[PDB]
Symmetry: C3
Subunit: 495 residues, 3 copies
């Protein structure tokens, strides 16, 4: 005979959530925060295309391997794409000193302008056209690196070369040259006649006199000789001088470094698509709305933080209890707008009014706890691409263990935070429904019988508007004091 | 006159446990998870012995220093043991280029097969037997590295050598050679006659022409001359060519790399024992049943995770309160099977029945919380052995700071987890005993007086089987409604 | 008519504190733990001054660039200060091999003693005074590095040099020498006459024969020639031998390494002040009383742990609620010594007595939780100074990413701990005031009416000393049993 109940929300949700102590708990509202799909393509970064080297490697492109395409337009890029094992590199076999350190410098570089420092037609005293090879073909012919000039003896003499370029520009200059290492002393004379030659080069900060290491080697790409290349950055206002009496592989073209910034060299086997992203990975681009992904560790752009987990979901509301009577027995499918509320049961009432003011105290402190934990990972470890030669293995592994180390550390930090605050989310829900109960029972005191299912029966009487009397905190015990006590002492001596 | 009490377990345990806020709290059940003893021996890893180099270093073994023993059987190993300062290395003094990079490659290597590429008896045009030294003795005689051939002028001439080996095998080949650096120009001619010689060597990817650096040096192991060694890996189907006019230290034997995998070079001063482990450390092996140890950071095998702590113990049950009456006053030594229960006190009852269904709801969620926190460290940072030469100090310290850095990070992660979930374990125990109380008081309502020690006295009466009426959740208030109220209004007007 | 209330402290505090779920909560007592001011000066470390190189670089000092000052006193230092771009280095242009590895060795070094190994006046067979240059001026004259001797042909001959130094000392010796690289073959003969010369040097472990790389270069500091320097550490009982026929830049002075320990090279643009600290950073010293700072990551000394946060404050007491009646309504400005207490309201009482025994159970477990969380970061990652040449960029970035990585990791660990234990601090306060309430209501049972504001009215009566009866846990219900029940059944049938 006349009731009021404390209860909480329940709905059709089946999304599940974990804590430290429980797995797979059905909750009423949750929020996935792990991105796990990608679009499988290479795309532009916010309107800036990558440089897709195709089957060419970085050396192939910079040296001008005849099978590689130059970028005459001087386009800026957002990153650079190189296949894992590019097929078009040093078509003429050899080595490329500090190649990896250079590939690294590329990673902070967004735009080149190729310029001419020594035109091919200016080597008056030597042969600048016979320097081609079956190893570097072009349309079936013998050709050569398009940016360096293989210099050959003219009419049986190699006059000593001394040429200098003064960097009048304001940008750094990337300059590449090399030296030729023949098979045998016959070939040395056949090509440069001087039996004993050097390639010397000087700047403010660079000092190197290179000599030819004649030796007998197996044939790569048809050649048993070798060409070894060098590089350096000529600073603004500085100058560079090459002196050679032979074997010199001369620069024609240098690269003006005209834009630096966030960039990268991505190893990927994919080609281009009409496509834009904010976050790009080697196997595809990412819809960067979630704060965490597990697609690939080497993502670049404005990206979610990478974590090694199959799932990462935060709890937002109650557990999903149908559930009857008061809150002791579970949730109310019949309460729709609010997480915690009550239920009119008078001689005319229907029920199910929510306590707006502790549900928007709730949806306030959880919506604020959600961003506060995301931002807690703003400074999470983003991994960076880097390469290493076959005698840099210790530092490669070092680099690999430090990037795995942090990925594991932040994977754990994120799993634990979600698990911990998920437990703190559900326990919070258990606290407000119990504290809702307590405000009404510290209101209705003697005047009301508390049933232990989560509901109260009144010894006095209360219409619809005395039910708002107790829902508001506005209830007045003396406004029914005398009535109520007169009506339970009648049960004390009742039936 | 007639009672029932809520209470919890208490026993003879004295194992202690810590939380964030308290130290040294006596608990009823706990679980150590830190392994801190080792067996003090070098053992096999799961049936696969290590390679114990004894007083020999890795170069000593690979070069065949006469005092080192070859491994003619070609045994596979689980790891390699090298004393800290091995005594048998380059018995003939010198250097060993990229030694550390090679020791590193050994760490991913489990089996060699030594093979012959250039037999000593095939150097028809030079002396292959006079090349021995008092620096490399064998049975008191002068001997030499057993795997390289010191080549000497024959009958006063050193014909130019050009020999090539074609790697017809399917495995990688480790090949070692060297060059001799004499004291003075007299000795250069005394041994090789050509005053100006080189050691050239080529592969697909290797190009090096080495020249002798004659200089005056102090005598190591009786010699003031030096031998400098080189190494390289000859790929399957590739070939290698040495050309020398003198000073060449020639390979006889190469190492077929026939098994790669998890391996390591352990620095340890211990010798072998008839002994097997699953986890091996430089100072001894570990009984790998616990998920954490503190024995040594450089453990290899299926190992617990290393942490810098003297202790790591998780709480499993209650605090250990003797403790009297209801739960307000502490635990019941008298309750044996269950963590939470009650106590029959009727006109014939004895007491102490456990609530099976919230104790195996308890021993369920703690046993599940224990493995869930162990596995939370599956991806914990395992450290790796690595070495560095005396001009690689910056990267040595880098490597040392990154491995300490992660050990400190995961030591903290583990101490905090245990401390935090230990507090969440004990607070949980406090929640079920209080919630056990609440189910019975929301059952027995008016019909019962609640004492505040944790017990209830009944205004009606209840036999043994009405005590199971309230222990089951099966109690019926109207089944004693009228009786009980009639019997406290008799106390309202009682004595 | 006659009352007692449960309540808690409230005061004039406005210091604010955050948790996982709330920001900016006003608390009654807190504790800042983040140091964020510095004194802006370079100071001594605990009585040991730094070595302030001023405008000179480390090479400038060690080589004796005429513009640098030697440290004749051989002072020990606590660290070394070098401006970012020092102006006084290789006044004679060139390179300094493994410079960074040497700067690193300095970081574990606290005291040099310069000693003489080859006095300038002992080069009887060559010119030891003409070796000066307009590039290395001193008082406007031409001078030279004060610690090496530029050796010149004597009277048109350069006799081959063979000199050796035997390290009879017990300390390690730092030894520096170099070689001269002329512009052209004329200058080579003009200075050393031998057209083909070397600089050879040997120790137990060092073997290097250096040759001059003549090339045409741009002029630095007026010179287009180059001097290239080398260094090595001569061990106790070992000896070193230089052999040259020219271009040798000879050591005069070596550095006895006489004290090693904690040291560093600090990059700072500041000069010295009459000043001592326990913790020094490049932009100033720190009052090292707090356990965390955010002043600069490269602090040295007994220092707080560096974290990237604008604020780090722990909660110590209650939230700051004026707040009326019992605890339901907030704090009591009127309670001064204790965090939790009560309030005499009898027919003569005043009120406000604190429960000493659960407030010093409180100020005990929070003061113990404060140090326990500080010490939890004893093993926090301290960063270390290190440098890298322009072809060591990959390992520079590696080093930078690993030191940022740990700073981010420990910044997060510390923000989360403070936020988490701040929530555990306030919830604890909410637990004791509610449990204080429960001890008194489990004491005064029937004999007392519980109002729901946090207070109780007595059906019996209780003077001042029956209020200590209930504050002590010493209350006796039968000592007012009969009285109280007789006096609420009078209200049951009352007005
Ligand atoms: C799930 O419940 C919501 C109300 O909470 C309702 O609007 C929606 O249509 C329901 N969906 C299904 C499939 O039942
Ligand atoms: C400790 O208590 C257990 C029962 O919980 C009992 O079986 C065991 O014998 C006791 N041991 C000692 C030494 O008292
Ligand atoms: C703040 O309160 C303390 C007592 O808690 C008092 O001693 C102090 O004088 C007060 N300060 C101000 C500025 O009101």
């Amino acid at each position: 005979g006349d009731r009021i109940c404390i209860g909480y929300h329940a709905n059709n949700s089946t999304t599940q959530v974990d804590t430290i102590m429980e797995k797979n708990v059905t909750v009423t509202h949750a929020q996935d925060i792990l991105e796990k799909e990608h679009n499988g393509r290479l795309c532009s970064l916010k309107g800036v295309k990558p440089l897709i080297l195709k089957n060419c490697s970085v050396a192939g492109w910079l040296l001008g391997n005849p099978m590689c395409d130059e970028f005459l337009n001087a386009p800026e890029w957002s990153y650079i794409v190189e296949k894992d094992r590019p097929s078009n590199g040093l078509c003429y076999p050899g080595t490329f000193n500090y190649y990896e350190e250079l590939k690294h410098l590329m990673s902070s570089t967004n735009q080149f302008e190729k310029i001419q420092i020594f035109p091919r037609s200016s080597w008056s005293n030597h042969d600048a056209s016979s320097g081609v090879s079956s190893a570097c073909p072009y349309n079936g012919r013998s050709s050569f690196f398009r940016n360096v000039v293989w210099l050959i003896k003219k009419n049986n003499v190699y006059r000593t070369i001394t040429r200098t370029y003064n960097n009048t520009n304001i940008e750094d200059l990337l300059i590449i040259w090399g030296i030729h290492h023949p098979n045998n002393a016959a070939e040395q004379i056949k090509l440069y006649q001087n039996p004993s030659t050097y390639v010397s080069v000087g700047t403010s900060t660079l000092n190197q006199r290179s000599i030819p290491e004649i030796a007998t080697r197996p044939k790569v790409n048809g050649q048993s000789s070798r060409m070894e290349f060098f590089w350096t950055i000529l600073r603004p206002n500085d100058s560079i001088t090459f002196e050679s009496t032979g074997n010199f592989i001369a620069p024609e073209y240098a690269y003006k470094i005209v834009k630096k910034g966030d960039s990268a060299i991505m190893k990927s086997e994919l080609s281009y698509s009409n496509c834009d992203t904010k976050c790009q990975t080697p196997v595809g681009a990412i819809n960067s709305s979630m704060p965490f992904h597990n697609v690939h560790p080497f993502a670049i752009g404005e990206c979610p933080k990478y974590v090694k987990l199959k799932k990462l979901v935060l709890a937002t509301g109650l557990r999903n209890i149908g559930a009857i009577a008061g809150f002791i027995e579970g949730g109310w499918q019949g309460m729709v707008d609010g997480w915690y509320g009550y239920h009119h049961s008078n001689e005319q009432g229907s029920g199910y009014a929510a306590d707006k003011e502790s549900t928007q105290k709730a949806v306030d402190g959880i919506t604020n706890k959600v961003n506060s934990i995301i931002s807690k990972m703003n400074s999470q470890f983003e991994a960076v691409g880097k390469e290493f030669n076959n005698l840099e293995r210790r530092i490669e592994n070092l680099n690999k263990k430090m990037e795995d180390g942090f990925i594991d550390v932040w994977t754990y930090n994120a799993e634990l935070l979600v698990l911990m605050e998920n437990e703190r989310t559900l326990d919070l829900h258990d606290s407000n429904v119990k504290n809702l109960y307590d405000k009404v029972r510290r209101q209705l005191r003697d005047n009301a019988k508390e049933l232990g299912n989560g509901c109260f029966e009144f010894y006095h009487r209360c219409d619809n508007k005395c039910m708002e009397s107790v829902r508001n905190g506005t209830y007045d015990y003396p406004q029914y004091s005398e009535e109520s006590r007169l009506k339970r002492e009648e049960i004390d001596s009742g039936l």
